[PDB]
Amino acid sequence: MNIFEMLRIDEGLRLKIYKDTEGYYTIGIGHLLTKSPSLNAAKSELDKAIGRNTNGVITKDEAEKLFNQDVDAAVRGILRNAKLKPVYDSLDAVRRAAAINMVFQMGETGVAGFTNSLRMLQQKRWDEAAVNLAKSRWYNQTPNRAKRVITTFRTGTWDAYKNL
């Protein structure tokens, strides 16, 4: 297991424009297109992302290409964020994947309220961190995925992704 296989499980793969858990137009492996309610606006973003006139449908190769870029961009974002870099640097590689997972799903604006969780993770207070992480809109709206990500932070293992 690694961040790519992990996010592939959590995000799935769909080759036509679909709406994510929040109702936003998305494609491929959790590639958010736009928060706009306009499908035409989504299609435009898709064409710009892929570099061709797609009309809402992409190939598996194209989806994986966007996916690699999105994972790369999430990591690069963490490393450029003063509030996230120290915690991320303090973690082992399995828990780093869990961190990248959260940023991929909610962005850096989404993780701004996790200040206390982040402190507990940097302190390696894994059970306490896990309890704090669950006290969130994130956990309530996507409990099954949050539980997997939280178990990864708690244990530093891939146990929550075995069987899947």
Ligand X SMILES: Fc1c(F)c(F)c(F)c(F)c1F
Q: Smallest distance, Å, CB 152 to ligand X? A: 10
The reply to whether 71 sits near ligand X by the rule CB under 6 A is no
x/- letters, 92..111, toward ligand X (CB under 6 A): -------x--xx-------x
11 in active site: yes
Q: What is the DSSP string of 80-135?
A: H-TTTHHHHHHS-HHHHHHHHHHHHHHHHHHTGGGHHHHHHHHTT-HHHHHHHHHS
Residue 39 marked as a ligand binder: no
Interface with ligand X includes 3 (CB under 6 A)? no
Q: What is the dihedral sign for C-alpha 107, 80, 6, 51? A: positive
25, β-bridge pairs: 19
Q: Does 84 bind Cl ion (CB under 5 A)?
A: no
110 binds Cl ion (CB under 5 A): no
Annotated binding site for substrate: 32, 104, 117, 132
